[PDB]
Write a protein that binds this ligand. Sequence first.
Ligand SMILES: Cc1cc2c3c(c1C)C(C)(C)CC=[N+]3c1c([nH]c(=O)[nH]c1=O)N2C[C@H](O)[C@H](O)[C@H](O)COP(=O)(O)O
Ligand SMILES: Cc1cc2c3c(c1C)C(C)(C)CC=[N+]3c1c([nH]c(=O)[nH]c1=O)N2C[C@H](O)[C@H](O)[C@H](O)COP(=O)(O)O
Ligand SMILES: [Mn+2]
Ligand SMILES: [Mn+2]
Ligand code: NA
Ligand code: NA
Lengths: 469, 459
Amino acid sequence: YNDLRDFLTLLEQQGELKRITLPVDPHLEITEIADRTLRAGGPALLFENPKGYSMPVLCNLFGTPKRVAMGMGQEDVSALREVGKLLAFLKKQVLNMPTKRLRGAPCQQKIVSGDDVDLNRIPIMTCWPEDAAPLITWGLTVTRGPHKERQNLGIYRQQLIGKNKLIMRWLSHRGGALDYQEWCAAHPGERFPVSVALGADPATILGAVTPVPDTLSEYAFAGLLRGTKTEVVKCISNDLEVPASAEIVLEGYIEQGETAPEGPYGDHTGYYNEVDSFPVFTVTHITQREDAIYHSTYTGRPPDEPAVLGVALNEVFVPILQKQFPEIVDFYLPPEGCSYRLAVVTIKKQYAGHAKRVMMGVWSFLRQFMYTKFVIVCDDDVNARDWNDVIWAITTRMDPARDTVLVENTPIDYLDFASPVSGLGSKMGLDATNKWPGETQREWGRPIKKDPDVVAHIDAIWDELAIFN
Amino acid sequence: NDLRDFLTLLEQQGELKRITLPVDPHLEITEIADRTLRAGGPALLFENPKGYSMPVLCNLFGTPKRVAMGMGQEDVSALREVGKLLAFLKEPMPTKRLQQKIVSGDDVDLNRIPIMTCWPEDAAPLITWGLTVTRGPHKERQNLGIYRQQLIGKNKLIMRWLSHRGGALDYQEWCAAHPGERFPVSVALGADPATILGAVTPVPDTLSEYAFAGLLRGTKTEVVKCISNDLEVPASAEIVLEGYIEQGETAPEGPYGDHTGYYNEVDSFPVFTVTHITQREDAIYHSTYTGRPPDEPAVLGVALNEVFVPILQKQFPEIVDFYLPPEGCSYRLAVVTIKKQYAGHAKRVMMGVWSFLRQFMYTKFVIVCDDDVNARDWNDVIWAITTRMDPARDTVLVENTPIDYLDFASPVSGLGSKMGLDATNKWPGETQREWGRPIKKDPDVVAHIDAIWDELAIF
Ligand SMILES: Cc1cc2c3c(c1C)C(C)(C)CC=[N+]3c1c([nH]c(=O)[nH]c1=O)N2C[C@H](O)[C@H](O)[C@H](O)COP(=O)(O)O
Ligand SMILES: Cc1cc2c3c(c1C)C(C)(C)CC=[N+]3c1c([nH]c(=O)[nH]c1=O)N2C[C@H](O)[C@H](O)[C@H](O)COP(=O)(O)O
Ligand SMILES: [Mn+2]
Ligand SMILES: [Mn+2]
Ligand code: NA
Ligand code: NA
């Protein structure tokens, strides 16, 4: 059973983990280093010597799509397509796969509680210069509602506001926030138990962020990715279960009515969002391993680690789209487009006008892409994931005014300030397919194809040529 | 069980009328059937066609009731249940092979059949209710389609399948996988109604239309091997034509009047050479026509839309009703009503009509309304259009979209624009005005008037 430490040793053996021994500040400097690293497609990072703390900081764990795949046991990212097909079928009895509860776990080797709780001992990162305060970013928040047994895991960012106080920033449609809201109605004035796990095994972490139904525990999906049940431990101060292999766990409660102004914080759009009120999470216990490692990240101008996660998890929808639109060869939402705002789609074109049907499908078929404001459509000779191919197609196959579709007064994310009116805006589709008779009266260009015999001969003599050494 | 059982059922219910007067298959049957259909009358069996001994059955499905009856059900509302069955097609019923007695060889003469000429400037007599059966070279599946077939000789028909049909794809692959070899084909006339309706229901290309008919019927489709090939045709068929398409052989087809109410201009299609004609002893010739709507095809199309509503609703649960009026040539305009949930919602729905199913890919007008509108009443739809739209703000135009190649109104063959009219009530964001509160009647006043209405005796 691979915990997180086993995963890190695997990565280190493969040149995918780098240890930094230089002093580095969790205030601002780690983010800067991780940002450069991720943008150059480099390794995961373990800062062994964080200025002013003894606990090492792990970040950029999933900064590469390969490492997302490795964290699910696989060679490559496509295994997620099979999960795509599985999730289709539920709308499979032994996907009622519970947790295996241990008695005793490394995450409860060192325990501290009540007045001894000091979150200031943890190297919590401050990501961006005008962020309100240090922020916990890779916590798996565990909750139960009052009406079912199911344990939801979510990643909700948590601002530091005291020795033993965090803000719990869950948006109102999240599992945690619904559970809390129901608890308040069903047990007026009673404290809401909550626990947060930092540094679980990778299948658990990836499972937390997969969009499974609210009906199902995210612990059960991680078991499917792993092939074995998720190993958990009961919390000390409540009946919630956290991953046995966790590096750190926070236990406590939300006092009903207690709230704090949250942020501003920089976020995945690359802007600061403005201040707003959220529940306060009071921390009564902190449990941890001997030698505990603090797992963290940051969100900002894309691409960041969340964006890269989002790209690997979209692979889930390609199969669902392809069932409906078999002409679709690939479907990609680049991280640099805030993960959902631009899509590039490649097709086997079969008739004049085909690109327009495809655009309308992206905008109508699934809800996850309802709010996608740019769609670029290309032929299957284009790698959707390489701007060198996509820009080539755009610049050699479009006449801008003929081949651009604009539609107005369409649904747009209320927080997208770039639209003229909250909730309402336009969308653009770019038809960059080759134009067929009817679409153009010109003689279209024949692309340059290489001689496969020449290519093969050069492969053979390439090492002997020794141009680099 | 077979077609004759269905005709006796219809006759018992006053839905089949026998004509004993002499009536010409050249032009006159079409005229009679057209009046009958437009007044919602019965199916017609012409027992004495001028110059032939074989009776002509037409307007079989000229009423939506009769389409429902032909699927075993009482009512047109039952068609939605058939739609939910058709939905069940996610991921991870064969034929019963056993009649027709008399058979011909080189005494093949299609002139002995009362093939109809529909409209005065049609090129020639035209076979219009043939179930064309084909196999491709790559799978076992037998596709059934309805393709019109011009008479060009004693033993020659033109096979007018458009290129996206199962038959035309099967042929195209056969040529290429077996260069220069004759393509076996068989056409069944007058099969049982479940088989006929199964043929025209758009099931997947993966699936045989024989299997679906079995679900509508409740029992396996009973079939028989053809005499001259390995294709299987319905055992209860009244007439069967067997033969082949000679690769490369084509003929100019038409002009023929079409479901749009205009003539298609002349065009080339494969020739079907007929080597055998099999039939029942008292064979009945099943035929129809297309023209200005409404016609039998249009009525078929209206009943089959009821099948699709559930499929659309599964995808788009905000859709309350979805209707394609016959007067729009059955597919060219759709009216959709929704329970609107957010600003801009109508646009998502328009794009769904235009992208989700292929039957509506070519639909050039879409009108979207709220659920207080009956989609099927132009009084409601025009009301919504004229009280909830600002034309320029609320009209969506999209250019260079796929369009039916025969639609002469588009600027270029195969390519044209589409219009969506958002006639929903406008929510904050979509308008800065105070929207109008509609007049709702007092249900207590309405009830009181229902009670005293007869006593009032106004009529
Ligand atoms: C991976 C990840 C996902 C974040 C996230 C982060 C990361 C690293 C942070 C912590 C770096 C900063 C932005 N985070 C938030 C967030 N959702 C949310 O409501 N508030 C957030 O602050 N998301 C998304 C959210 O956790 C996922 O959508 C979960 O699948 C929600 O699970 P649920 O649907 O069961 O509630
Ligand atoms: C009911 C009906 C449907 C006709 C039709 C007719 C009728 C009476 C005629 C004979 C009166 C006039 C025009 N017909 C043609 C036709 N499709 C086609 O490609 N060529 C045609 O000539 N259609 C539609 C077609 O037969 C159905 O949509 C099938 O579902 C197509 O089969 P497939 O999906 O298996 O390809
Ligand atoms: Mn959950
Ligand atoms: Mn078919
Ligand atoms: Na989740
Ligand atoms: Na068909």
